[PDB]
Homo-oligomer: A and B are copies of this chain.
Amino acid sequence: GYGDLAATSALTTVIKDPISLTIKDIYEHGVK
Contact = CB atoms under 8 A, between A and B. Distances in A.
Copies in the complex: 3
Interface in A1-30: 2, 5-21, 23-25, 27
B17 A6 contact: no
B13 A19 contact: yes
A20 to B, nearest CB: 6
Of the listed residues A7, A8, A15, A25, the one surrounded by the most CB atoms of chain B closer than 10 A to its CB is A15
Nearest to A25: B32
12 contacts: A2-B11, A5-B11, A10-B15, A12-B16, A13-B15, A13-B16, A13-B20, A13-B23, A17-B23, A18-B23, A18-B27, A21-B27
